[PDB]
Amino acid sequence: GKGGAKRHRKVLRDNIQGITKPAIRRLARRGGVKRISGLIY
DNA sequence: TATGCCCAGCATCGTTAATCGATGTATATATCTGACACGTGCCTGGAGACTAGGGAGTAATCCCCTTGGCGGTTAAAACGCGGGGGACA
Backbone angles phi, psi at A16, to 5 degrees: -70, -30
Which nucleotide is nearest to A20 if distance is taken from CA to C1'? B77
Contact present, A21 and A41 (Cβ < 8 Å) = yes
Bases along strand B below 7 A from a protein CB: 76-78, 86-87
**If DSSP codes are grouped into helix, strand and coil, which group holds residue A32?**
coil
Q: How far is the CA of A23 from the C1' of B20 (A)?
A: 103
A29 CB below 7 A from strand B atoms: no
Alpha-carbon span A18 to A26, nearest angstrom: 16
Q: Judge whether residue A35 contacts strand B, using its CB and a 7 Å cut-off.
A: yes
Q: Are A32 and A25 in contact (CB under 8 A)?
A: no
The experimental technique used to determine this model is cryo-EM
